Amino acid sequence: MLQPKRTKFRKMHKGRNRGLAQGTDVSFGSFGLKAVGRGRLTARQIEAARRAMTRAVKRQGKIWIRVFPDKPITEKPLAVRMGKGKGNVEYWVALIQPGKVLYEMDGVPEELAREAFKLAAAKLPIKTTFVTKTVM
Amino acid sequence: DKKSARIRRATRARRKLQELGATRLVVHRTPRHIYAQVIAPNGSEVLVAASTVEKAIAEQLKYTGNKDAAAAVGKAVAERALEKGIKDVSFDRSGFQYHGRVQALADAAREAGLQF
Amino acid sequence: GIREKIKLVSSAGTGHFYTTTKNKRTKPEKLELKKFDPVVRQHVIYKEAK
Amino acid sequence: MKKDIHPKYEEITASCSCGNVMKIRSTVGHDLNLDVCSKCHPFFTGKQRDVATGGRVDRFNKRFN
Amino acid sequence: RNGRDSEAKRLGVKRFGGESVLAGSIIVRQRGTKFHAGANVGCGRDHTLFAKADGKVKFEVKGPKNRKFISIEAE
Amino acid sequence: AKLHDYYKDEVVKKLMTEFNYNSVMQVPRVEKITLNMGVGEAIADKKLLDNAAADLAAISGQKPLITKARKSVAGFKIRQGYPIGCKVTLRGERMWEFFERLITIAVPRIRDFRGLSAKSFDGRGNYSMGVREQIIFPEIDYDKVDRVRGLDITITTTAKSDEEGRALLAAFDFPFR
RNA sequence: CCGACUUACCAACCCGAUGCAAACUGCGAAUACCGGAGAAUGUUAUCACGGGAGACACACGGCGGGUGCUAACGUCCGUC
RNA sequence: UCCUCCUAAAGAGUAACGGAGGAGCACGAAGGUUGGCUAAUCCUGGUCGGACAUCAGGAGGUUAGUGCAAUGGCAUAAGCCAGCUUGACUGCGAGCGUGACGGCGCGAGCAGGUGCGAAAGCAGGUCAUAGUGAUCCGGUGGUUCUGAAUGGAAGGGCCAUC
RNA sequence: UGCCUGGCGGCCGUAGCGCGGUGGUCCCACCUGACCCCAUGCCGAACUCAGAAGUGAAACGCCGUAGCGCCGAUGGUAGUGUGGGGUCUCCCCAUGCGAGAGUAGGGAACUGCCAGGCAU
RNA sequence: CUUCGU
RNA sequence: GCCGAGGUGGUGGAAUUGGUAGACACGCUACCUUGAGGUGGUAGUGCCCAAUAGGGCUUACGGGUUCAAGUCCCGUCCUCGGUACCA
RNA sequence: UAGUCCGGAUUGGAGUCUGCAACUCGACUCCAUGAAGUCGGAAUCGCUAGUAAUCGUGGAUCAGAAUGCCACGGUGAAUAC
Questions:
Q1: CA D37, CA D48: separation in Å to the nearest integer?
Q2: (3R)-3-hydroxyarginine (modified residue): where (chain A)?
Q3: Interface probe with F: pick from D10, D37, D48, D50, most Cβ of F within 10 Å
Q4: How far, rounded to the nearest angstrom, does the alpha carbon of residue D44 sit from its chain's CA centroid?
Q5: Which secondary-structure segment (H or E) carries C48?
């Protein structure tokens, strides 16, 4: 999984996922999987999509993960009442806005990139799209 | 280095004289010369200046960079200040130590009638 | 609270004292401390006392 | 310099063994005698004298004929 | 473990710019020196900026360090 | 003193003739000499520092400063503000006296002096050399042997680079193996 | 003791290209709030002093949020 | 119970068994004032000495320091060193801020007496915000203010204080 | 009136670094010596005093250069007060305000009083 | 105190 | 699940007022006594490097405070003791 | 009365001699170097008189190579209730 080594505080507020993305353009690779819809990805979904995409392209070329979790999501145990403090940190999500290039890759042709990106996008909760690297 | 260090030693008391609204007697010391100005409480105009680089003060002295040149400029700046009439001024030693030539000019203005 | 609580009494015109605090550990000396006495209306020497 | 804290600094005449004399200001309190000086030292003149750095074949031609 | 907080100290700018202040009246209660003292404005031991003359409050940005000052027009 | 005059004539002439110098204030002049004695053993004993103080007061002319610690280090068992060394700054006629005694009557006596290092120039012309024994100076009685207690001497020069400072030093027939 | 010859490797500081932050800010609104001036409006709507109170278990809806599972006709605030 | 930050929605305020940390002190110098100075961390050179002690120079500019948690501040330094000192002074106090109130806080200036400084000035504690408890009852000291016929006194009061 | 220089400011990076060239009659800086005032927690380095032989080396001032720092539009976008709407843990519409970043570009400051030297 | 099997 | 206590050499156990630990007693190693073991007596000993004086690493694991952490703050792992009630 | 003019290990250089041959691995010489060691823990050995202790010499083996072994003399005790 992906998780920040020594984050500053262990628990953090919920907040909202409002607004659009920042990593809009395909910058490191030639092909990218871009988020169409809003949501948040746990580190398990990110690593599962990475494994499926890597098995698909058989470890040729390079694959960039353009998003890090860095947001602890806490969750209370079972059969516990409300109150008594904030719950223990159980996983780490990444807040994903529309227009966010989640993944990038290069070194592979466009057809195997297309099949790999379907095989990776099947693991994520959000709707995605395939985008190509543009100039300007 | 030697110039920038003296500026902050002055800048402590220059700001206080700016707050109090005092008419400043600003001395300047150099190994060759000495200079004295009386600057108005705002700080944008001066009232009277006297120095050793004036010919009228320099021609009467042995050397323009000693204690006696300081005393002559102090006497001249007190006499010229009372030629205008500026009776109560406040002394600004401008970051120099007081005792050397700044004390000669200050003693000369104090003895010739410039009340600080 | 290990800093003990002392009074210091005027040498003359003794109808006034000041009160303060003093560490008995590091400074076991007297506290002379010339202060103002509003009965004599002058500044006099003062003296430590319990 | 401050007055009494410094030790006394008297001008003495130290005498080298090879024949040089040298008036210095020092604090030893007396006159002083030397052996080696800036002149007449094995390094300062040019007699530095590294050893043979291998006299082996010269030793063989000296020993054996 | 948590649940300890203090009581708020009611800081902030009390007399905004263009207001009319009597002498002694408090202009800014603050912690550091966010606003410095200018003409006819005193700084307390609290770093509280108060009025030393009657007039209009003015905020300015003076100094080489681009820092703020509070002055008073003696009106 | 004498080496000051030897500078002002011969070394100024030489350094005009070997570097192109536009001015006589372009020449490297030697600013100060600092004699540091980093005793370090004052973490427990106190009088050994007061003996090294008299050592630098004898070797040099004037009384030393006692240098305290700048930061505390737990590796060395020193604390913030413990008097861990001693030092002497000497400049003017006193550094010219000390420099003439160093170059003439002390530096042969370093007990197999095979020639000190010329690579010890730090980068801005300042030279630094460390003597291991304070008995090389003639100020020591040798009936009053205390400890080995060497020091380090740093000649600080107004040269810009290594080669200008080395020209200034070797102009004084400095040893330089 | 010098020390050289190379790699399945982990990699600081810098440099450029990417993101993230309630407890980060070299930037920074809209609103809100304070003060000054002007016309119209509103049965003085404002302030102070005095007689009498009640009330101090709130609920839901929008908007900004904490907690919860961005669960609850949940819980706790701000504002209407 | 008190202090700092966030929640807190750019005035103030604002809850929860919300998220994080601290205080129940210290200091006659660590206070006042005058004069002076300016960091951390790297690189290089150098006796022991070494990653890290002291020295010198350059880089760098406040990444340091503040008696103590955090925030705000700080170079005119509020940070660092030295001389002389006791303003850590008495009676007040215009006008404000802040609380339902008890209260708490800031304060120019005025009168007396000082300390530093050549002087203008500065000082009625400390860079600021924590370091604390009301009243009763009683203890010590000073003051003819009262003092149960009268003169005293005891006891009350008032002031300082525990 | 025109250059240079010095003192105090106004303004606070379009103003500051960098790189290069330049100034010495004055002014300034370095400098010479420290009998004396004063000075170093050692040290005439600094502070200070008595002096002008030397130099413009360093520092500073001035000119030049965009490698940076810096300023920076028009348009757009994000946000948002108010009134509506939905496919409502987010958005949209009518209207009002409208950034931050970036881009074109600007850019090696401007200036008030006083005093000195110079040339008109 | 003990002193491996035949 | 909550509270309290403890995790220290090969072992049992001490140092919890922040000043570079293992006191004690076993064990083990070398020597001695013994025909030879056992007991007994002497000198050792936490583990890496140099041949020394030394130097480094050492308190379950991770990180912070502090000039310095076994000691303080904190997270997780484990072992003990108490508790886990009223329908 | 000092690790010292004690001690003489270790090491460098220069040699000699025997021997076909001296590196592994001989003995000695000369110069330089100058280590541990200041009477030795628990324990344990030899000795009753020309003995213990101490000082030298000689021989066998042997081309060369004894601090061992075997012999020989010089000085020469203490104690046994």
A1: 15
A2: 81
A3: D37
A4: 8
A5: strand C46-49
Q: Is C28 helix (H, G, I), strand (E, B) or coil?
A: coil
C-alpha distance from D58 to closest chain F C-alpha (Å): 27
Q: Using CA atoms in the order A24, A30, A31, A35, what is the torsion angle rounded to 10 degrees?
A: -10
CA nearest to B25, candidates B99, B76, B63, B65: B76
Residue E55 phi, psi dihedral angles, 5° rounding: 175, -165
Chain F nearest-CA distance from D38, in A, is 4
Q: Looking up tokens 């303060």, which residue turns up?
A: C20
Domain count, chain B: 1
B59 Cβ contact partners less than 8 Å away, ≥ 6 residues apart: none
Residue type, A1: M
C-alpha span between E48 and E37 (Å, rounded) = 9
Residue with tokens 């980093």: F38
Does a structural domain hold residue E5? Answer: no
Amino acid at A69: P
Q: Own/partner pairs for B67-71, CB < 8 Å, 24+ apart? A: B67/B100, B67/B101, B67/B104, B68/B104, B69/B33, B69/B34, B69/B101, B70/B34, B70/B101, B70/B102, B70/B104, B70/B105, B70/B108, B71/B104, B71/B105, B71/B107, B71/B108
Return d(Cα B114, Cα F165) in angstroms, integer: 55
Nucleotide nearest to D56 (CA to C1'): L13
Range of the domain at F146: 1-177
- Residue the block writes with tokens 């008594």: A84
Q: Could you give the angle at the alpha carbon of E65 between the alpha carbons of E59 and E66, nearest 5°?
A: 35
CA–C1' gap, F35 and L51, in angstroms: 75
* Local structure of C21: helix, strand or coil: strand
